[PDB]
Design a protein around this ligand. Sequence first.
Ligand SMILES: O=C(CCc1ncccn1)Nc1cc(-c2ccc3c(c2)CCCC3)n[nH]1
Lengths: 400, 554
Amino acid sequence: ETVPVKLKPGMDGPKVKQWPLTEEKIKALVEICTEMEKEGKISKIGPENPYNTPVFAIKTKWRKLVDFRELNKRTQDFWEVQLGIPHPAGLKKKKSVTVLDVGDAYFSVPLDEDFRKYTAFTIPSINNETPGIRYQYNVLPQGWKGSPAIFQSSMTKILEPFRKQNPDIVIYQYMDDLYVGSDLEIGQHRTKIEELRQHLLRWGLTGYELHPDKWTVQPIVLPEKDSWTVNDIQKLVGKLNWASQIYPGIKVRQLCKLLRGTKALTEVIPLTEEAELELAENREILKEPVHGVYYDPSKDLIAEIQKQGQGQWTYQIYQEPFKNLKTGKYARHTNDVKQLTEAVQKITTESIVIWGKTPKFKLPIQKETWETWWTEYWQATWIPEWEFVNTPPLVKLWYQ
Amino acid sequence: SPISPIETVPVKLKPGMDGPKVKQWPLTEEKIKALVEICTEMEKEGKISKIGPENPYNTPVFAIKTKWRKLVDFRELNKRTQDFWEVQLGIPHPAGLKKKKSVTVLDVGDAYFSVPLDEDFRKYTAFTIPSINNETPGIRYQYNVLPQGWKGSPAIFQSSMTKILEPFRKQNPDIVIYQYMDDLYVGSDLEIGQHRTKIEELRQHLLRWGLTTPDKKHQKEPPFLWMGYELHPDKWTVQPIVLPEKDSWTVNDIQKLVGKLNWASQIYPGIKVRQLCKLLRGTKALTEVIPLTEEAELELAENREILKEPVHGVYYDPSKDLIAEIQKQGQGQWTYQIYQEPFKNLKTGKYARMRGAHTNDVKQLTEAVQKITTESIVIWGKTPKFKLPIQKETWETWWTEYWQATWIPEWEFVNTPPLVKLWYQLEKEPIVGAETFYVDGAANRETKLGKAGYVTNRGRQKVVTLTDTTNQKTELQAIYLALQDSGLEVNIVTDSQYALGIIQAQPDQSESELVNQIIEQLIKKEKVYLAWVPAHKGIGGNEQVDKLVSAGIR
Ligand SMILES: O=C(CCc1ncccn1)Nc1cc(-c2ccc3c(c2)CCCC3)n[nH]1
């Protein structure tokens, strides 16, 4: 028996345009969908279905990735309020977290007959030679937040013995993945994972190793210099002035005092060393977390990324601008687009571990460049939301 | 004409809506008589069926004239019919067609009428032929087939044609069928004999489904005239383009001219339309004559020369790679050609864009590469290999230091002047033994008046007044001032993130004359170092130029 999926009133299904795909991607999707249709997983549809969701092909083995970001926003009440999956606060505290793909679970469970139309997708053709191949889902689709929500009860029964035998192991389900955390020696943890894969194997279900306890902040780095120029103090005041909007108690009055009159930039001006009190106090504040900032489960998460050059990228996660919940860095034939997708995925993963939700990205790239190339390197089975921004000139050096 | 045995498409009305109940307006005796003749013929053909007064729905009917035609006003029913899947993403481009030994075009005769309509929906297509001066009940009918002017007809027809060709396509994988509206473009590499034999085999497969196509004598042969293109067996081009010679040019004549030039730009390289587009600014009336500028006359002349001799394009070979070459044509104008075999073009095109207010040729070139790549994926399903008029070093320098993630797929430099370059570069660290200008700009919001000035470490000072300015314009004026009165090596200190942001992106062109004046100064300079400081925080140097520009302003 199928669970009735009720859409949010006033708003109806997705009508998102299909992105042009390469010959290889189209061919791979045709093979995949011909097999899924033979298995009854998907069914061909007519023109009487006005809905559409984009579809892509990611990686030897090609796999189908359906972008349900729109349908998910249109079903927010179902998977978040009606059938919510509680996120454990203990998961980020574990020495090791292993990510397992469990998406194959969903194709066993049928989908509500009256919701199937909302899952419509098109396989495009080259030079529009033929009309696109249209399909809809008959089972719970991978990428639909509603799928782990419905599957919740089945997943609970599956894991019940493993959980009972291993009480100090935290298992969290987010979309098509299972997050398994433990405080065990790495060899014992990898052994417990293998044991869990066996429990999953008994229900038809079939790597990625994180260390959250080792996740530390990227403190706003203040220089250590033997000799300071007018320009070095100017750069220093700017960095501190900006940090005073975030961090409670940052001082600059004493450092500013040194900058008196129209002096040359290259001019070496020996420090009072009375002002060094600020430097030291500020350094101590910056290494510790932000006082007064707390995760608000009602508000969305925002992640901003800055290109720092030499394959290094910095990022900040917040809900209210300047109220950082987490900050960090990302370091690397690798190109900018490849590096940016890798950073987005690493930040998303950390975000699911810490808060149980993906952030909305502010990406320092051209919309078009991003849209053409992001799938070339994308490996995750989820897609976070994103915007295209023009990074302020100073935010880069303030986070350098 | 047959009415196809296909399973009908289940159609519905929009949620919370009932069918149309639009009153039929009294028609003239001639109009009524003509509708009676038409409708009895359509009824005899099975297209429409008589209904009882039980059906409460109605849609208006009209007649227009040697031969009279029936016009059904489906505006109301369309507004009540559900939404359908958008037929296509785009139209097939000739350059995307694979070269075939033999090609034939089959149009579907009375396409919509040859497809049945969902029995449960027929009800809502009800119409009445009124009686003379609306005395007696009118003659009532409903549709059995897809009606002309109704919302679902294009979609249901296309979907039916797909379902019908599906078996034929399977049992003939070496035959290509292109589906566009009521047309079928059928191509194979078979020698004509067995090809025209395979066409008849397809025609027969279509007739089993109630779909009529013309026979050997009537079916279309190359050269095909389609969508403004001329399709020949081994080449393609755009339909004859003629540029009118006019004493006076109206807004409409320039509009018609830009469209023709843009259409010609798909195969004729070099086409420019910038000067002719600039004339169309100002919102003038269609009949309003626009006198040409020397530059517009100059642009039109170059285009005439390009179009003087005819040009064609070739078809696509899926085995060979695609090559795209780009050339800087001038100020914001780029031109490209896509080929497989050196200088035998599949297509051409142009790029001109203002993706902002301040830009440079390196940014413009990445934008063109992106646009061309997207186009290649759409037409051929693969990205081209680029030949760019930019050195690898120039690219490497730009991308490595820029704030934005920027990428260009596999490319090669080609020495095709003008070459793409950066005209200036800011210093990384402050200059030793160069003057340090502390610049500032301020503007009163109530009067729109403002002051722009500088204070240096060498005693120098200056304050200029501006009358219809903004804070932004005064901040840029202050930088321009310092660049004017400084000499070949200078350090500039501003509190403007806005100006810093502009100048840091190394622009070479702007919609602002002020930014362009700043650019020509930055180019002539030997070494320039720009730096930023927080505003109103009592920073030495900035504090002195702050009080100066704030005098009689803020
Ligand atoms: O041949 C003619 C013009 C004949 C003519 N008119 C006037 C005088 C002399 N001859 N018409 C025509 C051409 C096509 C066509 C061509 C190409 C393609 C499609 C359709 C569908 C998509 C794929 C590519 N349809 N009808």
